[PDB]
From a paper:
Collapsin response mediator proteins (CRMPs) are cytosolic phosphoproteins that are mainly involved in neuronal cell development. Like the other CRMPs, it is involved in neuronal development and binds to tubulin dimers and microtubules.
Two different version of CRMP-4, full-length (1–570) and ΔC (13–490), were heterologously produced in good yield in E. coli. TEV protease removed the N-terminal histidine tag of the CRMP-4 ΔC efficiently. CRMP-4 ΔC crystallized in space group P21. Firstly, CRMP-4 ΔC was solved using a modified model of CRMP-5 ΔC as a search model. The refined model of CRMP-4 ΔC was then used for molecular replacement of the full-length versions. The crystal of CRMP-4 ΔC contains a tetramer in the asymmetric unit. Almost all of the residues are resolved in the electron density. Residue 490 is missing in all chains and residue 489 is missing in chains A and D. In chains C and D the serine from the N-terminal TEV cleavage site is also visible. The asymmetric units of CRMP-4 form A and CRMP-4 ΔC each contain four monomers forming a homotetramer with internal 222 symmetry.
Residue numbers in the entry:
A (entry chain C): 11 to 488
B (entry chain D): 11 to 489
C (entry chain A): 12 to 489
D (entry chain B): 12 to 488
């Protein structure tokens, strides 16, 4: 790593995913150098007294959309403001989605994302590459991005008919390929064919408000796509990763598949963990539009509690935010037609507090599983353990002094995001970060961010991570 | 109905789906005329003494393929020999599938099926019409078949890519249309896109035998299609009917949907009720080929017991056979490539004994639920109750004197089918018919069939049967 | 016995198997002809149904009229309670004989017969509660079945040190009832754990009615149900779960039936109509009026789900457990929820509640409605087709039902002596217009026409086919 | 002359969280360094691992060495039985203290300590069975937790009129154990209904071993499991289901865990390795050798399924319940299955069975194998990371494991004194090559090198985080 001053944290309760213990932590030049008691260190090292508070690995948000092109527009939180929002909330790494235009080069899109992120990201980051269309030369590009460019994760779309949607035949070809090359097959799993029809029906009945968005994507259509993707991934002996798990029925399909032995992961996001979809019916149009995202927040109010429960039980493994913010003015292009409302909400800053408040303080999971679902499982899946997601000697110095007793109200007044709205507005959350260390530097202290634009490094992610692929390889050899 | 002599059955245990009781039955001119004791009857009426044996409504096999065209060939049991096989096994009505070629007229195919069946069927029958392609004029034909030709059931294919398979958009349009017109939407539910790929893979590894057939259609691909069809049918408020339920996973999806309130039916067949798919690996090639059907018999040997269990519990509702037989010589065209083995097995003659043996004698269901899953549920679904599927005054005189203590070994030597092979060969089955009455005539007595070719009548089936559609209509009336 | 001739014309006859238009001619308690242009004597009283539905009269399989309780008696006796039944479209009731422990079952039965024969407005039958067990009770159970028209007996898993029976006793009882051809009913909650949870709730100063529901969480219904299912399966005895209140309990029955177990579930008007949120009402007397065991679930998703399973056949029939107490009797428990007497209303509202919640919402059709209000009860209890069916030879108990009528339920207007109605203010679609019982018009134009004691006891034979054919075939097997 | 230093080179270290290549240096019972080109003293004994796996030693959480039974004793004592453990790659065992009803728990514990301290070849710990319940037992439970290194106590739902406790007692016991930070274990079968079914089976003339399985159908395991789960949930007490034998029982645990309940399941070698069809063997002695409670399921789909749920984490850890009896002791029950003493072998075969049934079949990887053979047991029983992990500072118990070895299991070749092996003739992929325990080489080249009594008792503190942090948070709402 890059240089950073020496730094010693004393009296912390170190909390990894496997255990908790009291020890001091000595850091230098981006790395954790020693862990233990009465450490022999040079004189005059900057020393932080943790005072029994928790020290956890920094959060890894595996799903972001910073400065994402969308129909001429760009999301309002770019790689600089968006990672300030990440760090403010205890997240020290992000993994964004490269989105090439159909009939455009995957690799050129990747180079373009790299230039944006290398110049702006405050913290370390990596990339998924979205497979928005499929043909032989895309397949060649996929191969090269894995071999040469530090990519191990690719997402296909089952939604967005005539834009990104791929057929069952293409899903089989793609999964077959990604499995052979040791990559993670990600999906955006909703049935675009049926959604397309339901949109038309909803518009025809005169339902043009944001409620038309959630009503034309009932969870049954997420569940169907998830099952179909699970089925095809199983036949092609390819590991599957369901992005943005929003409904109970979808999560149950992942739970059921994992019990059978299928290699399948589920990624709930801050939105589905934090809140429900009743606000699509808000008399305040701009508020309702701010919740518009796909798949949508479920209107079933039992949903968020249930998603936290399955994240706690390991039926879901890791969290993201799918942070994809648009301005009030950009949202308003869809005022008389919900299909023109740009899709996306906030959630990068709030992810870790939401999970602590909903799943730890309610007793569903303990602090160690909290570390697993905020960083360590992401690190293992994406072949970043234990460099990330673990406080141990040799690992990167990304870590957070966490206060389980802190209590904050979430507001757009106070968030790092450029967005005028926050879908978690007015929610009181237990659990918050006090101090954030990233690359061995103090980037959050006493409410203040200390960041340098572009300091973030791209972290290449190798294929065939053991946690995912050893089972796959044993199944092949049979 | 047409003329038949008067006929009296005395001392029977009448077994309907709702109750059992002792009464005599008087029949005349195709109809049941009286039911009760010490019936006042004319002199010289032919009288059959039932001697405490069961009298049940005749079986309705809701899935047959008599003399079906298949790639230049024809199945070997035509409408005449095939309904002799039906009657020999206690089935008095069949419902066959009209299969029009893609891009061809549904109505012309229907007329062709009517001519074949009207001239040959020994017993009453009706028709499903397969929607093998979709466009505006097919939709117009569907409309007319329902209005003018006594059709209320249509099947779509999720399998057979580039032959019959329809897209999700087409599934939605079809289910929307069939639901509006009051028809039953049937599905052949397997994922044809993935099967196509898996066939290619299996051939490339050199697996050309019949095991390649089952290995390229694993139950996962039935289940997926079933779930997708269930999902679309729910969104379009259309009742769904899953034909040939073969696996545990598929039947669980139907079970799960019904519990949520979805109007969904499942049709296991004699094959999935009677036996498993281990025989695809038989060293006798011709035997293995004889089991080749789609979806295939599951290799999981726990499957038949479980399918009977869910038919007993009402998670599955009715039985068919999908009787679709080919000769040894016809099967053999697929000797070097499992994909060219013609698809289909026997099962019309054995359906009722198989269910009795596997579900009634093992205690899973009682005799009354046996009547429901062999006739009465079929009658209610297809809008034929109580003319069929019930012994009561005014109903048709199709009925069977059934012996719950009889025990028969199934063999190709003894079956009515023209096929050289029987997939239930050597199986001992408890429960068998003794006497069969159809149109008020004795068509099976003391082991002998008494049939007239072409005596069968086409039974028109009206749309909007209450059992299926009252719930649908009530749902149409809400937000 | 005698009733005037009576003809109903222009009705839509609705049985559980089909619906059709025909006229109905009745005489001397029996249906005599069904069809069109019926040849009948001159001057027969004629009712024009005008296309409205004619259904078999309701069979409420669970009542507690004038039930002894701690010196007191429920306020609806066999006369007032069956007026309430008939007002709501129910023409038959089946009440529970409750002998004191250590007391004769048969003497209690004779006492119940005298009360009911002298007061019941309509036909009725009896369950006998097995409140203790020993060899002479077993002899009595045998006599009641052979000689006294009883085929249904209930054991208690709740009420420790009062009625609760041990696992050993359950096995003996289920073995015996199964050999003699009877229905084994259960009040299935774990009384041992409830006893402890009561103590705990009192010790946290929770004396209000919320303590009642909070000390009987559904987990304790579910446990008992599973244990009763298990023992009944080992002893090859059919099981009948009374008062199914929770989702978890109904799922255990659903699951058992799918495995082929002979098991029935009896939801009641309360669990079908409403939830348990009202145990937290600041109006103490209102909250106390919901106190019954097992309790109404506080999970508001419960009533919709119970209707769903009744629609799907996972539950088969409905009762009310009508067991009413006065405001003054309820108030005994004002400082201790354990002294609040247990029971609510529901006999009058059962059929409207099910129509409104399950038929008008599209979950079941009218024919399944007849099944769950009369025909399945008749088959289980060996009363088909004398009851639960409009056909020649059956008893003339029937109702002209208006699927379009709309009524608000109030204590002002109910037949019950109780000051409170748990369904107060609820608007219900579906209501009876005319009620015929024993061939006599007992409800017409909002007015009841009853004769005290006109009801007959209906003996119920053992071994009903619907229940026992499967059991017998299993007995015969190796 | 005074020390055991030991270096293992060229191993593939396999922990439950990750795998990597490094050398391992050990001294005086501890792992001292892990890495490459380690600076080490001259003349240190060096073992070349040659790319083979190095895993933490197995922890068998369920044994019954030299257990009393009706005046008799199981034939594998603490010495021979831990030789069998080590031979199969297990370096720690946790046995059950069984006090007689109406007898002191603490006196039974002292007796178990004397037996085991004098004989065990390897480290060990103890569960204490609560075979009866009253105020002074409760006092003893408290003292064993505070002063005697016990954190795990088992109750019985079976054995009516011998050990069985009532629902009220279950509630009291779970309430107490939860407050004191202990693991509540259960032997979960309905003893009331089993007692009846035994009598019925004898009265039909079914006296052979088939009567044993037929009188304990899995329905009765499942019922007891659900009841125990239910009571433990109400009392906010963590529950541990010993000897998970059936699919239905394991589903109940799976279902509870998904709801958030703190519940663990312990399949054993028997339910992981084989089924119950052999209760019908015409060879009586063979059938009797399978007699254990709960019994092996006759449903042959069972062992595959148990492995599947152990792979998915629906079950967490493995034991053997090693409880062996001689042919002669088994034969007491020749005319009555109820007199057949209950127990089978399994300590030696546990790790190879799991590797063969779950790793070689692709259900789980090698790292989850480590979790279900040692690391999850260590975390549950408050022994992580001293046990169940190859890391600096942890105990030097570890195994060089050969994923490619293939062995046939036979009684000819096992360490056990028993004449019968329920896994007789089974071919198993996966075997240990070398076993290190307390830093000493106790297995090399097919030979055991053990010293009787070298084992140490390992005190197990209450409130292990993995189990109790969720419980405490719930207490606090
Ligand atoms: Cl879309
Ligand atoms: Cl196909
Ligand atoms: Cl109680
Ligand atoms: Cl026992
Ligand atoms: Mg940079
Ligand atoms: Mg004809
Ligand atoms: Mg009277
Ligand atoms: Mg009640
Ligand atoms: Mg020692």
């Amino acid at each position: 790593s890059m240089t950073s001053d020496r730094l010693l944290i004393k009296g912390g309760r170190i909390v990894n995913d496997d255990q908790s213990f009291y020890a001091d932590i000595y850091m230098e030049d981006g790395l954790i150098k020693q862990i233990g008691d009465n450490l022999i260190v040079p004189g005059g090292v900057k020393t932080i007294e943790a005072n029994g508070k928790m020290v956890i690995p920094g959060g890894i948000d595996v799903h972001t959309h910073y400065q994402m092109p969308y129909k001429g527009m760009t999301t309002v939180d770019d790689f600089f403001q968006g990672t300030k929002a990440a760090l403010a909330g205890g997240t020290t790494m992000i993994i964004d989605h490269v989105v090439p235009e159909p009939e455009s080069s995957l690799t050129e899109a990747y180079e373009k994302w790299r230039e944006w992120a290398d110049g702006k990201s405050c913290c370390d980051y990596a990339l998924h590459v979205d497979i928005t269309h499929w043909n032989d030369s895309v397949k060649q590009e996929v191969q090269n991005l894995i071999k040469d460019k530090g990519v191990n994760s690719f997402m296909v779309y089952m939604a967005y008919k005539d834009l990104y949607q791929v057929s069952n035949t293409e899903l089989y070809e793609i999964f077959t390929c990604l499995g052979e090359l040791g990559a993670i097959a990600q999906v955006h799993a909703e049935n675009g064919d049926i959604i397309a029809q339901e949109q038309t029906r909803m518009l025809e009945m005169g339902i043009t408000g944001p409620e038309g968005h959630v009503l034309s994507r009932p969870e049954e259509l997420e569940a169907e796509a998830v099952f179909r993707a699970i089925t095809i991934a199983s036949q092609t002996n390819c590991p599957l990763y369901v992005t943005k798990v929003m409904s109970k029925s979808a999560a149950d399909l992942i739970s059921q598949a994992r019990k059978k032995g299928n290699v399948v992961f589920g990624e709930p996001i801050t939105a589905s963990l934090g809140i429900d979809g009743t606000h699509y019916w808000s008399k305040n149009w701009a508020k309702a539009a701010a919740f518009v995202t796909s798949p949508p927040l479920s209107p079933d109010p039992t949903t968020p509690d249930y998603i936290n429960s399955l994240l706690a039980s390991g039926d879901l493994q890791l969290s993201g935010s799918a942070h994809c913010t648009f301005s009030t003015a950009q949202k308003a292009i869809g005022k008389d037609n919900f299909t023109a409302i740009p899709e996306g909400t906030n959630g990068v800053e709030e992810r870790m507090s939401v999970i602590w408040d909903k799943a730890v303080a309610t007793g569903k999971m303990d602090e160690n599983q909290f570390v697993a679902v905020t960083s360590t499982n992401a690190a293992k899946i994406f072949n970043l353990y234990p460099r990330k997601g673990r406080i141990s000697v040799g690992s990167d110095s990304d870590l957070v002094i966490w206060d389980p007793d802190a209590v904050k109200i979430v507001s757009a007044k106070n968030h790092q995001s450029a967005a005028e709205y926050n879908i978690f507005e007015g929610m009181e959350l237990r659990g918050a970060p006090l101090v954030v260390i990233c690359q061995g530097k103090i980037m959050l202290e006493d409410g203040n961010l200390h960041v340098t634009q572009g300091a973030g490094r791209f972290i290449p992610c190798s294929p065939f991570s053991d946690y995912v692929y050893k089972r796959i390889k044993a199944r092949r050899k049979m």
